[PDB]
Amino acid sequence: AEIYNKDGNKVDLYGKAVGLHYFSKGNGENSYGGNGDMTYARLGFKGETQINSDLTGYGQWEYNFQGNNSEGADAQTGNKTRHAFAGLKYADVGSFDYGRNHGVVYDALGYTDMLPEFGGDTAYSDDFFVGHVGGVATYRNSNFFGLVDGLNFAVQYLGKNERDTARRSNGDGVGGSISYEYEGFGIVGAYGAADRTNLQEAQPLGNGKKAEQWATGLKYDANNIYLAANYGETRNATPITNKFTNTSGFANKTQDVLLVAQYQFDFGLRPSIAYTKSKAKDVEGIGDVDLVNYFEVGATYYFNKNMSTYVDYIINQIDSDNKLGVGSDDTVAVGIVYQF
Amino acid sequence: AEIYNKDGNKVDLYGKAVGLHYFSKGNGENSYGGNGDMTYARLGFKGETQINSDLTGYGQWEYNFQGNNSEGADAQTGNKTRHAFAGLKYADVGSFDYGRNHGVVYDALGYTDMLPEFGGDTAYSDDFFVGHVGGVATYRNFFGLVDGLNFAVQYLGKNERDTARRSNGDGVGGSISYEYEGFGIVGAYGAADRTNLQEAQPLKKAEQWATGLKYDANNIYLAANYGETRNATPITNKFTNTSGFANKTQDVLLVAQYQFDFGLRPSIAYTKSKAKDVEGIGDVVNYFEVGATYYFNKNMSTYINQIDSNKLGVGSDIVYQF
Amino acid sequence: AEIYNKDGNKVDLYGKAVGLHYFSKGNGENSYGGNGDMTYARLGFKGETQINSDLTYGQWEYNFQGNNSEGADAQTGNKTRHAFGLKYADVGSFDYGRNHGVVYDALGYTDMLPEFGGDTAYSDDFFVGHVGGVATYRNSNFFGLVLNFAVQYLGKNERDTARRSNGDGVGGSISYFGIVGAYGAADRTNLQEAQPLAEQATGLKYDANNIYLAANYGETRNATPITNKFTNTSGFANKTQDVLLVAQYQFDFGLRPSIAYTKSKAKDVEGIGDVDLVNYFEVGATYYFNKNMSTYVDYIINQIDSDNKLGVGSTVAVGIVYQF
Ligand SMILES: [Zn+2]
Ligand SMILES: [Zn+2]
Ligand SMILES: [Zn+2]
């Protein structure tokens, strides 16, 4: 909701309130998602200022508040800052922001991250270039300095974050992305590589001096139709954690595909089908394991622009003999989301 | 504060800044509350959208920020998401919302939860149906026909918390009220399955109910509520270091408050809750209240334990808003 | 940003989004400030209502850190800065809650650097910074006679750690180029007295013709906390001698170059005796774009000895802050 425009500074304060619930077989411990309450609410601001006819300043922020938690010591469980950065867009030169932003490989992963509740499984938080990552400088360029229409590229730095845990750690990195949209159709191809922290390399699973992610995507966005498809492979990046022995680490090689097909009613109902598959290779002692693999049947009915409900049943494809203990039961979400 | 209204969507962003200090004998170890700083702040949003003339959508949220905490490692303590739900009201059919909302037994218990700071002692958080409870589906003047009487039905899904205090299972709850002639009646009850963790506590189904009768007119507030819980109320022991729920409790809440247009609102209240047939000690909070809250405008305002020295060790001895 | 005026009530909801990063040789083991990401965000409200003709506030401010991951460390740095009053005619103000310390009034004249500076202003350290639950009576323009004064009550705060604990105390400040002086003393906590290693400054400033010349001196008495890397033991400097010098000229162009020198030295601390806490030379060039978006560089020449008692480090910030 735009709540202030004066002396030429726009400030949008937005928020959600998703009443959410997962259903699986008796506390879905062996399922895709889980079981019970998932109610959460977000609260961020978008702020743009106009210094010149060409130069604008922005700063975005976004915090996650969890409603499933009690008022005990776990009241903060899941509370986190999703977005926090500030930047300058200048004429046709391009934009530049630093802070906690998306990774270049999310530009490519964005094409398919569109299911009502689930999807975008490959887009891990604090996993280098596929999602929210702390302290990252990002230069983006739209329409190649205004010359070519549709061709966009971006270039990302991503500085070192020596975390206490190896799960969220990262070192000096480099990332790129390229897109081309031509009347409905869309192609994209991102790639990024970074040094792995010594704590990450001292993990049981996964070996290699540096981490690497890339993915390429196609989409059709016209006539109230979305057909999204992307594929990507990580090498020494994806967290995997064996459920049996409770020993975590990174997958030496992954092969990930996302297919999304949804149609949009002007009536409001948006049915969605989706198939995802992320398969690990060269697992330190197991070999080829399926991280995630399923079919999706989703129907979101937007009431107005400020209110909706949705259902996301996920056909869990993972066989019971999963040599990593990853869930094999089915999950279905039921949500009523208000926003502003 | 209503901060946005456009294209059929009202959005209210509200907040408080209570500067509060507690006073008891010395450090108030065995007191009602505590002693020292108690400063805190609320900040939440309310948000209704008009889908139709009949169908309106809503969403609320509220989070607590404590001020008495230092800026160090303890800064997050007390910070909690109070309210968070999203629902639909439809013509005279009624409302339905899911998320962290108010329990049906609070509808009847809320008749007396109107003291300045204290009061509503039986309204325990994450305690089945008597307070702020996580993830709960809630349906709330009889199809528009009979005005002045409202009913509600609540579901409450299972919540497998680490601690026994906050856990629960599948349940059912009802509430029915009737208000007229500046007065109101209400009666709510609920029952639920307990987790095996809950069943395995020293001190497997929980029951809680209460009724309330009140009168508000001529700036006079006369509230009374009474009810009993069964295998619900947590209490634990300080001496024995043993936690658990009370087999049965006997709870009464008596409030009388008069609002003087001058601003001073004197409030006299008496509360009493006695646990029954507790496994170890048998039958064992109760006090009389003195309160004067001074309403300035629509924003600014400012504002006797009867428990013998007890086999349990129960204690003895300015708000801006927008 | 004022987001609501109706029925004579102003509700200003403000916020920032600072993209910060510290630079040091390889890692920040033996540096002043640190190294890596420092991105954070502020978000509070300033709420004033007029009750009558003469008598009229409620303020709050929370910290959200951005260098944290969405793992377990997400609330690392998250905290409330402010939460609390009335001003009546010429009587003056009075508020209770988590607010500033009276010794900050003198320290505030020099707490004016891009990112660093104001080292004497520790959080929850007697009266030199942000402290919880304090009644503060402040009077404006001396009842309209001339001069400004304030009195803080500072309630007891029985904290688990010795560093963040506090008891009852009293502090005063008076201000009127510009000069100011503040003093405060309080009963030390049980754990304050039971620690191996309290009373506490006056200020001068000149803010006119696009120049800011700031100078203040202060001495601590068993309140400034410190620990040493060698013996890993917490405590309090029995006495410190603190100086802050700030000299900056603000161009109409927008660029604001700043040079600053700070020095705080502890005295007869039970264990190390007289040691120098912090000492450096600062060169900063903050560039205000407009009244919202701005950036800054903050190079700091660390004047702490290598062979240093307590082993304090022997840095340069780069920020791009949007605000509202
Ligand atoms: Zn995002
Ligand atoms: Zn409530
Ligand atoms: Zn402050």
- Interface test mutation site (partner C, options A3, A54, A80, A170, max chain C beta carbons within 10 A): A80
Q: In terms of domains, do B51 and B103 share one? A: no
The token pair at A320 is: 């019971």
Chains that touch A (3 or more CB pairs under 8 A): B, C
Q: In terms of domains, do B164 and B186 share one? A: yes
Measure Cα distances from B80 to A65, A66, A200, B45, B242 in Å: 9, 9, 33, 15, 26
Contact between C167 and C156 (Cβ < 8 Å): yes
Residue positions counted in chain C: 324
Contact A84 C17 (CB under 8 A): yes
User: How far apart (Å, rounded) are the C-alpha atoms in residues A284 and B212?
Assistant: 65
> Which residue among B55, B81, B107 closes a domain?
B81
Residue C65: CB atoms within 10 A of its CB come to 21
Return the residue matching tokens 């005026």.
Answer: C5
Return the residue matching tokens 């007869």.
Answer: C268
Closest CB to B68: pick one of C45, C132, C160: C132
The token pair at A119 is: 């999807």
Return the residue matching tokens 């700091």.
Answer: C300
Handedness of CA B261, B263, B264, B267 (dihedral sign): positive
- Asked if A1 is an interface residue toward chain B (Cβ–Cβ < 8 A), one would say yes
Contact between A13 and A21 (Cβ < 8 Å): no
User: How far apart (Å, rounded) are the C-alpha atoms in residues B259 and B265?
Assistant: 4
User: How far apart (Å, rounded) are the C-alpha atoms in residues B1 and B15?
Assistant: 8
In a domain, B195, yes or no: yes
User: How far apart (Å, rounded) are the C-alpha atoms in residues B290 and A338?
Assistant: 41
Measure Cα distances from C160 to B73, B78, B106, C101, C164 in Å: 10, 15, 35, 21, 8
Residues C231-246 as b or e (16 or more Cβ within 10 Å = b): eeeebbbbbbbbbbbb
Nearest CA to CA, how far is B181 from chain A (Å)?
Answer: 37
- Print the SS3 string covering chain C: CEEEECCCEEEEEEEEEEEEEECCCCCCCCCCCCCEECCEEEEEEEEEECCCCCECCEEEEEEEECCCCCCHHHHCCCEEEEECCEEECCCEEEEEEEECCCHHHHHHCCCCCCCCCCCCCCCCCCCCCCEEEEEEEEECCCCCCCCEEEEECCCCECCCCCCCCECCEEEEEEECCEEEEEEEEECCCHHHHCCCCCECCEEEEEEECCEEEEEEEEEEECCCEEEECCCCEEEECCEEEEEEEEEEECCCCCEEEEEEEEEEEEEEECCCEEEEEEEEEEEEEEEECCCCCEEEEEEEEECCCCCCCCCCCCCEEEEEEEEC
Beta pairing partners, A58? A48, A87
User: How far apart (Å, rounded) are the C-alpha atoms in residues A83 and A102?
Assistant: 8
Contact between C4 and C11 (Cβ < 8 Å): yes
- Asked if A45 is an interface residue toward chain C (Cβ–Cβ < 8 A), one would say yes
Return the residue matching tokens 């840095």.
Answer: C315
If we measure between CA atoms, which residue out of A179, A280, A266 comes closest to residue A237?
A280
User: How far apart (Å, rounded) are the C-alpha atoms in residues C211 and C247?
Assistant: 8
Residue B217: burial class (beta carbons within 10 Å; 0-12, 13-18, 19+): exposed
If we measure between CA atoms, which residue out of B238, B239, B229, B242 comes closest to residue B279?
B242
In a domain, B255, yes or no: yes
Q: In terms of domains, do B69 and B104 share one? A: no
Contact between B271 and B253 (Cβ < 8 Å): yes
If we measure between CA atoms, which residue out of B297, B215, B221 comes closest to residue B259?
B221
End-to-end C-alpha distance for chain A, whole angstroms:
5
Return the residue matching tokens 């043993």.
Answer: B242
The token pair at A263 is: 């149609």
Measure Cα distances from B78 to A80, B42, B60, B131 in Å: 16, 12, 20, 16
Contact A51 C19 (CB under 8 A): no
Contact between B135 and A67 (Cβ < 8 Å): yes
Residue C76: burial class (beta carbons within 10 Å; 0-12, 13-18, 19+): middle
Closest CB to A304: pick one of B3, B51, B100: B51
In a domain, B69, yes or no: yes
The token pair at A89 is: 């867009």
Chains that touch C (3 or more CB pairs under 8 A): A, B
Contact between A67 and A119 (Cβ < 8 Å): no
Contact A58 C16 (CB under 8 A): no
User: How far apart (Å, rounded) are the C-alpha atoms in residues A201 and A237?
Assistant: 11
If we measure between CA atoms, which residue out of C30, C39, C31, C97 comes closest to residue C64?
C39
User: How far apart (Å, rounded) are the C-alpha atoms in residues A254 and A122?
Assistant: 10
Nearest CA to CA, how far is A34 from chain B (Å)?
Answer: 12
Closest CB to B36: pick one of C85, C95, C158: C158
In a domain, B199, yes or no: yes
Structural element, H or E, at residue B150: strand B149-154
User: How far apart (Å, rounded) are the C-alpha atoms in residues B37 and C132?
Assistant: 7
Nearest CA to CA, how far is C298 from chain A (Å)?
Answer: 17
Nearest CA to CA, how far is A51 from chain C (Å)?
Answer: 6
Beta pairing partners, A336? A19, A309
One-letter identity of residue C135: A
- Chain B residue numbers with beta carbons less than 8 Å from the beta carbon of A41 are 61, 81, 84
Q: How was this structure determined?
A: X-ray
Contact between B123 and B104 (Cβ < 8 Å): no
Q: Which residues contact B81 (CB under 8 A, 6 or more apart)?
A: A41, A65, A66, A67, A69, A75, B61, B62, B63, B100
Where do breaks (C to N over 2.5 Å) occur in chain B, by preceding residue number? 140, 203, 284, 303, 309, 317
User: How far apart (Å, rounded) are the C-alpha atoms in residues C52 and A170?
Assistant: 58
Strands B94-102 and B80-90 turn out to be antiparallel
Contact between B182 and B215 (Cβ < 8 Å): yes
Domain containing residue A46: 2-339
Q: Residue B201's domain is classified under what CATH number?
A: 2.40.160.10
- Asked if C229 is an interface residue toward chain B (Cβ–Cβ < 8 A), one would say no
Beta pairing partners, C113? none
- Chain C residue numbers with beta carbons less than 8 Å from the beta carbon of B76 are 75, 78-79
A:58-87 residues touching chain B, CB 8 A cutoff? 65-76
One-letter identity of residue A240: I
User: How far apart (Å, rounded) are the C-alpha atoms in residues A260 and A234?
Assistant: 21
Closest CB to C66: pick one of A84, A88, A167: A84
Q: Which residues contact C260 (CB under 8 A, 6 or more apart)?
A: C110, C113, C117, C244, C245, C246, C247, C281, C282, C284
User: Longest Cα pair distance anywhere in chain C, in angstroms?
Assistant: 64
User: Longest Cα pair distance anywhere in chain A, in angstroms?
Assistant: 63
Q: In terms of domains, do B222 and B134 share one? A: yes
If we measure between CA atoms, which residue out of C77, B161, B58, B293 comes closest to residue A75?
B161
The token pair at A71 is: 């008022």
User: How far apart (Å, rounded) are the C-alpha atoms in residues B57 and A339?
Assistant: 10
- Chain B residue numbers with beta carbons less than 8 Å from the beta carbon of A65 are 61, 63, 81, 84
The token pair at C242 is: 């603190």
DSSP tag of A164 = S
Contact B318 C85 (CB under 8 A): yes
Contact between A112 and A217 (Cβ < 8 Å): yes
How many domains is chain A partitioned into structurally?
1
Contact B13 C9 (CB under 8 A): no
Q: In terms of domains, do B254 and B131 share one? A: yes
Structural element, H or E, at residue B197: helix B196-199
Where are the strands (E) in chain A, listed by range?
2-5, 9-23, 36-37, 40-50, 55-66, 80-90, 94-101, 133-141, 151-156, 173-182, 185-195, 210-222, 225-235, 253-263, 269-283, 287-304, 307-316, 331-339
Q: Which long-range contacts (CB under 8 A, 24 or more apart) does C184-192 make?
A: C184/C101, C184/C102, C184/C103, C184/C126, C184/C127, C184/C152, C184/C154, C185/C221, C186/C126, C186/C127, C186/C154, C188/C222, C189/C158, C189/C159, C189/C162, C189/C165, C191/C161, C191/C162, C191/C165, C192/C162, C192/C165, C192/C167, C192/C222, C192/C236
- For A75, the 3-state DSSP assignment is helix
Q: Which residues contact B241 (CB under 8 A, 6 or more apart)?
A: none
DSSP tag of A91 = T
In a domain, B86, yes or no: no
Return the residue matching tokens 């049915």.
Answer: A271
Torsion of CA A277, A282, A286, A287, to 10 degrees: 70
Closest CB to B134: pick one of A1, A15, A68: A68
Q: In terms of domains, do B115 and B263 share one? A: yes
Contact between C135 and C119 (Cβ < 8 Å): no
If we measure between CA atoms, which residue out of C80, A306, A159, A284 comes closest to residue B17?
C80
Resolution (A): 3.4
- Is the backbone of residue B280 left (phi > 0), alpha (psi -120 to 50) or beta? left
DSSP tag of A197 = P
The token pair at A5 is: 């425009």
Q: Which residues contact A59 (CB under 8 A, 6 or more apart)?
A: A45, A47, A85, A86, A87, C16, C17, C293, C321, C322, C323
Q: In terms of domains, do B53 and B127 share one? A: no
Nearest residue on chain B to A4, alpha-carbon basis: B3
Residue A172: CB atoms within 10 A of its CB come to 11
DSSP tag of B316 = -
Contact B79 A74 (CB under 8 A): no
Contact C124 B70 (CB under 8 A): yes
Instruction: Compute φ and ψ for C93, nearest 5 degrees.
Output: -95, 160
Contact between A324 and A286 (Cβ < 8 Å): yes
If we measure between CA atoms, which residue out of B123, B42, B50, B47 comes closest to residue B85?
B47
Return the residue matching tokens 């201000």.
Answer: C175
DSSP tag of B305 = B
- For A63, the 3-state DSSP assignment is strand
Q: Which residues contact B74 (CB under 8 A, 6 or more apart)?
A: C159, C160, C161, C164
Q: Which residues contact A49 (CB under 8 A, 6 or more apart)?
A: A8, A9, A10, A56, A57, A58, C289, C290, C292, C293, C322
If we measure between CA atoms, which residue out of B103, B108, B110 comes closest to residue B126?
B103
- Chain C residue numbers with beta carbons less than 8 Å from the beta carbon of B65 are 60, 62, 80, 83
Q: Which residues contact B200 (CB under 8 A, 6 or more apart)?
A: none
Contact B19 C85 (CB under 8 A): yes
Contact C133 B39 (CB under 8 A): yes
Residue positions counted in chain B: 322
Measure Cα distances from B85 to A68, A79, B140, B166, C37 in Å: 11, 17, 14, 19, 35
- Asked if B38 is an interface residue toward chain C (Cβ–Cβ < 8 A), one would say yes
Strands C2-5 and B319-321 turn out to be unpaired
Where do breaks (C to N over 2.5 Å) occur in chain C, by preceding residue number? 56, 84, 146, 176, 197, 200, 314
Residue B150: CB atoms within 10 A of its CB come to 18
If we measure between CA atoms, which residue out of A12, A5, A8 comes closest to residue A46?
A12
> How distant is the alpha carbon of residue B194 from its chain centre?
21
User: How far apart (Å, rounded) are the C-alpha atoms in residues A178 and A108?
Assistant: 8
User: How far apart (Å, rounded) are the C-alpha atoms in residues C278 and A99?
Assistant: 29
Contact B58 A338 (CB under 8 A): yes
User: How far apart (Å, rounded) are the C-alpha atoms in residues A174 and A192?
Assistant: 5
The token pair at C36 is: 């890596």
Q: Which residues contact A82 (CB under 8 A, 6 or more apart)?
A: A42, A44, A62, A63, A64, A100, A132, C70
- Chain B residue numbers with beta carbons less than 8 Å from the beta carbon of A340 are 4, 9, 11, 45, 47, 59
Contact between C103 and C79 (Cβ < 8 Å): no
Contact between B252 and B232 (Cβ < 8 Å): no
Nearest residue on chain C to A167, alpha-carbon basis: C71
Residue A331: CB atoms within 10 A of its CB come to 23
Residue C137: burial class (beta carbons within 10 Å; 0-12, 13-18, 19+): middle
